Structure formats: C-alpha cells, structure tokens
Design a protein around this ligand. Structure first.
Ligand SMILES: [Mg+2]
Ligand SMILES: [Mg+2]
Ligand SMILES: [Mg+2]
Ligand SMILES: [Mg+2]
Ligand SMILES: [Mg+2]
Ligand SMILES: [Mg+2]
Ligand SMILES: [Mg+2]
Ligand SMILES: [Mg+2]
Ligand SMILES: [Mg+2]
Ligand SMILES: [Mg+2]
Ligand SMILES: [Mg+2]
Ligand SMILES: [Mg+2]
Ligand SMILES: [Mg+2]
Ligand SMILES: [Mg+2]
Ligand SMILES: [Mg+2]
Ligand SMILES: [Mg+2]
Ligand SMILES: [Mg+2]
Ligand SMILES: [Mg+2]
Ligand SMILES: [Zn+2]
Lengths: 64, 211, 25, 95, 125
RNA sequence: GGUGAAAUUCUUGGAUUUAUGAAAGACGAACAACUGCGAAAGCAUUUGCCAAGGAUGUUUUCAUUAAUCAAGAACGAAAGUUGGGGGCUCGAAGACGAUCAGAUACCGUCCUAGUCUCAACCAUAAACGAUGCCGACCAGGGAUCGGCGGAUGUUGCUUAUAGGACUCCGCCGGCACCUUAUGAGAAAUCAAAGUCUUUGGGUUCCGGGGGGAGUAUGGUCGCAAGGCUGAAACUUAAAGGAAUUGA
RNA sequence: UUGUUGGUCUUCAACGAGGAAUGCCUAGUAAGCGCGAGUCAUCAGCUCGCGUUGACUACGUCCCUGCCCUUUGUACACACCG
RNA sequence: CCGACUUUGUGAAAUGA
RNA sequence: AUGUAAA
RNA sequence: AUCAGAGUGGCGCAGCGGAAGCGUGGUGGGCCCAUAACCCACAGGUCCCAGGAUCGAAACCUGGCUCUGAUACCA
C-alpha cells in the first residue's frame, strides 16, 4: 500500500532514451522539501511541473 | 522459528575502556546441543572505535573470542586484530616503497602468536624528486630492525600488556624512533596480530582480566 | 594464420609421406 | 610501418614482463601493456550520502571509499572507452 | 542493538544476509531473485531495493535496531567492483527505516590467486 | 550458477549464503614504474648459506696478452616426450546446453593430458629493438638507475659530529626519453638507420623478382614430434614496401 | 462492335476495418469535401492548380534508413554489390 | 552380510511413554 | 552469409 | 527354400476403424539492390495391387507384387 507522492520538476537535466524520448529530470518532494531525486519522465515536461509518483525510492542515473 | 532463541550479552575484558560490545543469540539449551558448551567459541568482529569511544581508532578491528559464559553473560578475551581494507588500500599507493615484515612470538603467558608490521617511507619537505624509493638493502636493514624491535617489545608478561601496547600504537611510533637513521617511515603500524595457539581455558586466569 | 596452418598441413602431409616409406621400406 | 615508438608497452632493459588478466575478458596481457587505472570510488554516489549520514549511529563517521586498481586489455579498454583512437599527431603525448 | 548485514553484491544476483554480531546465525537472508519474476531482473538494483525493504521489515520484527554493513563483491579471481545492487541495497536499507553502524568492504582479494577462468585469450565475445 | 537472454548444472538427502577451523596444491596482488639484474631465454614473499657479476674508486700489478670468429661447445620461453611425486585452479582432446541454415566455433557446465616438482630429452618462437659485434667523431636538455667527488642546511635519528634521508653542482657507466635538421632515408622515420657516388676502421652471418618450398631426395641429430643441411622440373609479370586522395 | 458517354427500370456480388510487412505528414499542415484546367469532337477514377471544414501528436533523438565534417583502419579504386 | 536372544555386569545423561 | 563469364 | 518385417505427401517417416499428419520439399506474398536466411499464407496423397467382415478401413483377416533381415546343421 504505497500512497502516491508528489514532486516538482526543478530543472530538466536532459532527454535520454534510445530514441531520445524519456526526459530525465530532477524532482523536489512537496511533502518534505529537502528530498531531491533524479527521475525519468516521458512526454513534454517543463520546469515547475508537479508529478504524481507511485513509487518513490527508485531513481535513475546520469544519462541512463 | 525464532522463538526458542535467547540473546546473550557479550562483555569484553577490563583492558578495554568500553563494555557490552554486542548481543548474540542461541537456540534454547537442550541436552545434547546445550547452548553454553555448544557454542562457546564465537569469534566476534568488532572495531576498536566503540571499545575506546573514539574515532581516531576507527580502523584497527579487533576480533574477540568467546571462551566462557556466566549466567546469561558471555565472557571474552582478545583473539586477534587487523586493519580495515579501506585503511590498508588507502595507505598503499604508487611512487613509494611498501615495507612489510612478520615474526613469530611466544609471550610469557603460554601464547603463540604472529606479528605483521608495515611501513612506508616519507617524502621529506623540499623533496623535489617525484619518487621515494629505498634501495633493497635499507629495506632489509629496517625489516631486521622491525623484527628485533617487535620481539623486544614482546616477551612481556601477558596479552594484557601486549594489547595495551597495541592500543596506544606503541609498536609503530617506536619503530620509526628506532629507525629514522635509515628512513623516516611514515605510517609504521602492526597490521595483524594472529593468535596461533592459545594454551588452555584457565577460568581463574580469565577472571581477573575479565571482571 | 594462413602461414601457420599451411605449415601444419605440410607437417601432416610429410608425416604421411614418411609413413608410406616405412611401409614400402 | 611502425605504429608506435615503444610498441604500446613500455619495455626497455627487460626481456620478459609478467602477464596479468583483463578485468573484463580475463585475457592474458603483459603488465606493462595493460591499461591500468586505480579507480577510487565512493561507496554511494553523492545523491545518497546525506541519507546515510542520516543513518550512521555514531556521529562524525566518514564514508569508506573503494580503492581498486582495475586492469584492462587494449580490446576492452577501447570497447569501454577507457581510451580512444587519437590522431597521428595527438597520439604521441603522455599528459 | 546491533546486527551485521553481509551485502553480497555481485552481478547476476544480489544477496542481503543479516546475522548477529558473530556471523553464526542468520536472522534473515532475503535474496534479490526471491523478489522478481525474471532471471534477468534478479540482478537489477530494483530487486535489491525491495529485497532490502523486506530485510528491514523482518529486522524490525526481530529486534536489532542498528546494523553494521559489510559489502562484498564476487571476489577471488573475478571482479572486485560491486554489482549494481550494492548501492541500491544501502540506499533502500538506510531509508526504509533503519540505522547503519559501520560500512566496510570485505571482498576477497588474494595475495595472489589461482588461474582465472577464461583461458589465455579470455572471454572473446 | 551463468548470460544480452537462456539451458546443461547444484538444490527442502538443506544448494547459494555466514562464521570458525583443517588438509591440499598452485600463485606471490596492491607496492610495481617509459625502474633494476641477467649473454639471451628470463628473474618480484622472508631469512640463512654458497659461489659468481657489471659499474664506481684506485699514485696496485701483467704489458698487447686484443676484436670478430668456419669447425666445435654451453645455456635456450611455451608446447611436446620417457618415468616417478602432486593432482587446488585453469584446461587442448572429448561429452554435453545454447546460437545458427549448418556450429565439428566464439558463448555456458563437466573434463583427460597438461598446468606444478624431480631425473632425462627436445632445440624451436613476431626467441623483437623485425636494428650482429668491437671502435671513433658528431647536438641540446631535463629526468631516472648505481658508484664517486664537491657544496650549506633541515632532519621525529645521531652521548655530539660523521654518517642515513633530502636540496644543489659535476663526473663516469647504465635503461630510456623530449626538440631540431645542418645530415640520412623510398618515405615512414632515425641522434644513431649520420659521418655514402666527396663511395675504403676491423670482422662474422646473410639476400639476388614471385611461386614451387624450408618441399623432394641424400646426409645428420632425436625415443618420437621434429631440428640442422636442402634442390630441381614447371609456372608466373608482377608479388611487395612507404606515403597521398577517395570509397 | 470488344458496350465512347449520359440517362430509365431491373439484376443487389465480395466487402464484419484487413496477415507479413510498408507509405505520407509537424499548422489552415494531415484528413474529409467539392470546383477549374490539361487531355477533348465525346470519354477524368489521372495530373496540375483552387478554395471549404479542420484536428491528435512532437517541438525531440541517432535506435532503424540515410547525409555532412573531423579522427582512425584498410590486402578496396569497376571503391564493400570491394 | 546383517537382526534378535545368550555370555552380558556397573551408573549417567537426553529424548518416549 | 554471399555477389555478371556476358568486357 | 522356408520364416519374419516394411510398403503412407516430392524424400525420409508418424498413425489405436469418427476418416491423415511431421520435418522438409514445392507454390504466393513480405524483408533485401539481388539470392539465401528469416516472417506471413497456400496446395498435398491412387494410405503397395485385389477381395471380404465391420455402425465405421489405410489399419482387421486373406490372396498378388517388391525390397530387406534371419535360419539353412551331424554326416
Ligand atoms: Mg640491464
Ligand atoms: Mg621475448
Ligand atoms: Mg548451508
Ligand atoms: Mg627496482
Ligand atoms: Mg608481495
Ligand atoms: Mg628461425
Ligand atoms: Mg630475426
Ligand atoms: Mg646519482
Ligand atoms: Mg628468388
Ligand atoms: Mg603499404
Ligand atoms: Mg476533363
Ligand atoms: Mg494520363
Ligand atoms: Mg522508411
Ligand atoms: Mg587494386
Ligand atoms: Mg561482402
Ligand atoms: Mg556461394
Ligand atoms: Mg517462394
Ligand atoms: Mg529473398
Ligand atoms: Zn579485456
């Protein structure tokens, strides 16, 4: 029973993927605002977007 | 499945400042698989940082031997020591010489053990030369000094005073004070003290060191 | 290694030519 | 044609150099020819270091570090981009 | 109250092995492949994520509150670089609710080892 | 376990993992290098012993005793051979599981000989610096290895100094490297492959287009594998080296 | 005439959104809808123009196919279909 | 080859009753 | 994997 | 000479009456510049020749053909 948690995209680091189709962003957690994690995001995403996030403790790695 | 397990309190001898290094557990004492005599020889792996309440000695793991239990309270005596691998790999680097030695020692208490010593030359200040190598005969000379000094410091009373020479790093800091006439040898140490063959149980001998 | 394996072929062939001579000796 | 001055290995004054094993394919290449890097990595990368200083029981504790001297052959070094094919002129420098 | 977490972090799999302070009794041994369907997922860092979450829960349900970590690679005559699951296991096993006492690498490193699998030219693929 | 993914394989007769310990045999990490020694092959744990060795130093000796060397001789990696010891790891052959059209291969598991040691053979490697050996001259520099000489200036040393480490300067003898043609070269490149048509220091070996071929035959050595010595017939107009542009 | 075409009544097929594969397209664009011209004595399912209605997706990447530059390798030059 | 009884006595512990 | 003899 | 065994897709072969397939081969697309290879579809046969019984045969029995394998010994 994970409770879906929220983040804001502070900066868009890049655009990874074989076909360059998974944005790699750096998210900051709303519920406790000192946790910043690098995640993968698909589709158009800009700065300040709020992302719902089912499972939290996974993170990506630079140029995944 | 984990309900027939009782914990036990591992308490270290009086030659260490801190006590109660940890908690072990055994199956409840039956007969034929009695717990007390059944295990009786745990070898715990505990750093010396939490036995001296410091962080300068965060390296220098001590391995301690469980040798008796007294009423839900596990006695212990020293059984050996070593560096942490991060420590040793941090010390050993390029562009210098690594010096090592080893000796068998029989302390007055009927214990046989082995000493491993290690050393590394210094770059003196103003040394413009990129490297610091000895010349394979001074290596042998200071290896011979380490042998002589370490056996000299040994042939003492007991593991008590031997280990309390270990604790303040006696051996190292009077290896270079014995050989700064050949090379400085920054980071002289004793990596490993291997207790080869202990004499016997000797509960009385245990008791005053471990009270 | 075409050079090496040509050498090995001639080694085998010369061994077999030798055998035919210890036959017709 | 001779591709390099020293042959890709620094062997002068010797006749035989003890071989070693590539850390990836285990190929036996001489110790003076293998691409040898002394990698010293953190136990965890810097995005997970605050989170372990928030879990170390005793304060003032510093993270250990992985020291390891990895060896590669030329094949695996090229393939994994440890080293790269450089121009005829840039090839020579050792910096 | 202290335990010891032997994190065997090789490739192809990852082991998280918790014992008492002596190494003679395994309180819990959760394996990355116990928590996935794929014989290729068995080595990914995610497998170590959740297989460490369950270590933490079965560790709270046994009592020991702080943990001496001891990481270890394949060792011997093989790689000495921990598998992908090492850092994932530490990351998840610290933040799932737990206390880490002391980190240390106990990977087997030989003074010099026996001959290594692969032959002279080695694995050429 | 293993891989990209698999399966062969091990496993509730408790594998994998953890700790303690014992046996076996192998290997000697990191230190470890444009570093040393060795005639080359080669030689990295410790101490002892045994002989040997280059350099350095020398106001010691002999006095040309020297250089290179057909015949002849010593050593000569790995493999391999005869026979003991050992039998960990790894592993030709062999057997499997994959892949594939095939897969007698690369990949994964088991593995014999072998890997190790002894006694005795063998005599070849891209045995390489693809660069014989001794000698002289010629261009510059900083490194570094060993020895020696000279500097004051600090040692977590030294009953004080000397000496050891370190800084500076110079000699020899090493292993090399960086810059430049005024040189050489087909150029690549080379401070020795220079001092070559302005051609001559000495000496040994060795090549005469490509194949046939290090083959046949003869000899000789070897237990054998093979080694050393080694043609012809015929065929061919190119084969080959270096560098340029393009693909 | 092997019915040029256009009407009228009747005849009322397959086709249930199409396998492997593959094409075109980034804003009045795709797609839907008609008109005009070319051909023409007649025949427009075509081609070239024209407007009408009017979007989803993306604002990327070198993974597939290719292109340009540099480096590198080459036993290729009719040039890797070597 | 192994099983039981017999020579075959003594006391001690741990598991079944 | 491979690539007219038809110049 | 007797006695078994087997005659099934183009080839080698599976089949237990309701009743026909497997690999491969062939035919048509697809990928490729083109051929393989690979992906997707398509069509198969006088179930050796001639009878019978059997709801129901290629199978079951029998007659005819062709190959193969055995046994043909004491004198
Ligand atoms: Mg030398
Ligand atoms: Mg060699
Ligand atoms: Mg077990
Ligand atoms: Mg040296
Ligand atoms: Mg060593
Ligand atoms: Mg030769
Ligand atoms: Mg030669
Ligand atoms: Mg000097
Ligand atoms: Mg000729
Ligand atoms: Mg050429
Ligand atoms: Mg018209
Ligand atoms: Mg037309
Ligand atoms: Mg296309
Ligand atoms: Mg040509
Ligand atoms: Mg081709
Ligand atoms: Mg062909
Ligand atoms: Mg076809
Ligand atoms: Mg085709
Ligand atoms: Zn490799």
């Amino acid at each position: 029973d994970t409770q879906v948690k929220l983040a804001v995209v502070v900066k868009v680091m890049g655009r990874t993927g074989s076909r360059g189709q998974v944005t790699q962003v750096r998210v900051k957690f709303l519920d406790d605002q000192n946790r910043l994690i690098m995640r993968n995001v698909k589709g158009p995403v800009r700065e300040g977007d709020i992302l719902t996030l089912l499972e939290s403790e996974r993170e990506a790695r630079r140029l995944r | 499945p984990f309900t027939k397990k009782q914990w036990y309190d591992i308490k270290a001898p009086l030659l260490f400042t801190s006590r109660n290094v940890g908690k072990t557990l055994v199956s409840r004492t039956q007969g034929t698989k009695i717990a007390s005599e059944g295990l009786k020889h745990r070898v715990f792996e505990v750093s010396l940082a939490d036995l001296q309440n410091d962080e300068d000695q965060a390296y220098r793991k001590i391995r301690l031997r469980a040798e008796d239990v007294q009423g839900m309270n596990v006695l212990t005596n020293f059984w050996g020591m070593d560096f942490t691998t991060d420590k040793l790999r941090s010390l050993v680097r390029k562009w210098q010489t690594l010096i090592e030695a080893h000796v068998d020692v029989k302390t007055t208490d009927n214990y046989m053990l082995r000493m491993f010593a290690i050393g590394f030359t210094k770059r003196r200040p103003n040394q413009v030369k990129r490297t610091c190598y000895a010349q394979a005969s001074q290596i042998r000379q200071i290896r011979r000094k380490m042998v002589e000094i370490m056996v000299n410091q040994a042939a003492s009373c007991d593991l008590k005073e031997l280990v309390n020479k270990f604790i303040p790093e006696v051996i190292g800091k009077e290896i270079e004070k014995a050989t700064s006439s050949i090379f400085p040898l920054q980071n002289v140490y004793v990596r490993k003290v291997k207790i080869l063959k202990a004499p016997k149980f000797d509960l009385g001998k245990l008791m005053e060191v471990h009270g | 290694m075409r050079a090496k394996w040509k050498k090995k072929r001639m080694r085998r062939l010369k061994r077999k030519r030798r055998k035919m001579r210890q036959r017709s000796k | 044609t001779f591709k390099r001055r020293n042959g890709g290995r620094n062997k002068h004054g010797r006749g035989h150099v003890k071989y070693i094993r590539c850390s990836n394919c285990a190929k036996c290449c001489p110790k003076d020819k293998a691409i040898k890097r002394f990698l010293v990595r953190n136990i965890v990368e810097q995005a997970a270091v605050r989170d372990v200083q928030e879990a170390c029981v005793h304060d003032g504790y510093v993270l250990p570090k992985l020291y390891a001297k990895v060896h590669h052959c030329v094949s695996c070094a090229i393939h994994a981009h440890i080293v790269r094919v450089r121009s005829r002129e840039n090839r020579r420098n050792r910096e | 109250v202290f335990g010891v977490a032997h994190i065997f972090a090789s490739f192809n799999d990852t082991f998280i092995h918790v014992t008492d302070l002596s190494g003679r009794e395994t309180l819990v041994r959760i394996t990355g492949g116990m928590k996935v369907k794929a014989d290729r997922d068995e080595s990914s860092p995610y497998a170590a994520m959740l297989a460490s979450q369950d270590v933490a829960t079965r560790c709270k349900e046994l009592g020991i509150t702080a943990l001496h970590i001891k990481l270890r690679a394949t060792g011997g005559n093989k790689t000495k670089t921990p598998g992908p699951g090492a850092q994932s296991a530490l990351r998840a096993l610290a933040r799932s609710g737990m206390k880490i006492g002391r980190i240390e690498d106990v990977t087997p490193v030989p003074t010099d080892s026996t001959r290594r699998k692969g032959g002279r030219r080695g694995r050429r693929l």
